[PDB]
Design brief:
Length: 218
């Protein structure tokens, strides 16, 4: 029922001591805490990221909820916002959406304007051996989802239960985007949790308002 404070963001508005209350988080590149939320991409052609420092090891099951929005720009762009669960590596690349090398081991959930689906959530797996080629449409799951230019936040909820043969469910605003049993690495290995974004000169503002992790399904 209760969230795991050690793997969650604190209430960002209520923060008084930024250094203390964010000690478990790495702020990457241009991300800034501004008037009660993180702005990942505050300027033209900026990138930013938030990563939990400790690796998470699942007990039975887990829920991650990210509350986010994109404000200020609706239209054509290669910019986007990624949510990551990554395994066993520590390169310095930000080539993929301000967040990762094209070659990574884990799960990337991407909000972007896909050349063929348009405004969408697309989910990708990589096993660390190949460069992910995004423009070949190699995602294992997807849904259409409107995110650009809304003050009203959305919530991504990822639930994952190894005990139910690795059922992973991804909901956007409490509506199912996809469900899968293809993602299994989180049941048996520690992994890193984070988010990243990149924009362009149109200054799309990708923002994180809240993040909670729960040590079960809710
Ligand atoms: K910190």
């Amino acid at each position: 029922l209760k969230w795991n404070k050690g793997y969650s963001l604190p209430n960002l508005l209520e923060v008084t001591d930024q250094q203390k209350e964010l000690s478990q988080w790495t702020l990457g590149d241009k991300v800034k805490l501004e008037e009660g939320r993180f702005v990942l991409t505050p300027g033209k052609n900026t990138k930013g990221s938030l990563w939990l420092k400790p690796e998470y090891s699942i007990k039975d099951a887990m829920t991650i909820e990210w509350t986010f929005r994109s404000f200020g720009f609706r239209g054509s762009t290669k910019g986007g916002l990624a949510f990551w669960l990554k395994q066993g590596n520590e390169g310095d690349s930000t080539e993929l959406f301000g967040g990762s090398s094209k070659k990574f081991n884990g799960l990337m959930i991407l909000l972007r304007l896909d050349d063929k689906l348009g405004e969408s959530v697309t989910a990708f797996l990589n096993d660390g051996t190949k460069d992910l080629d995004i423009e070949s449409s190699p995602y294992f799951a997807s849904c259409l989802f409107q995110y650009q230019d809304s003050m009203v936040p959305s919530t991504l909820r990822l639930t994952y239960n190894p005990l139910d043969n690795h059922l992973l469910k991804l909901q956007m605003d409490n509506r199912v985007c996809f469900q899968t049993r293809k993602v299994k690495f989180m049941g048996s290995s520690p992994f890193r949790i984070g988010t990243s974004a990149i924009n362009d000169a149109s200054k799309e503002s990708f923002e994180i308002l809240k993040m909670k992790l729960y040590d079960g399904v809710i």
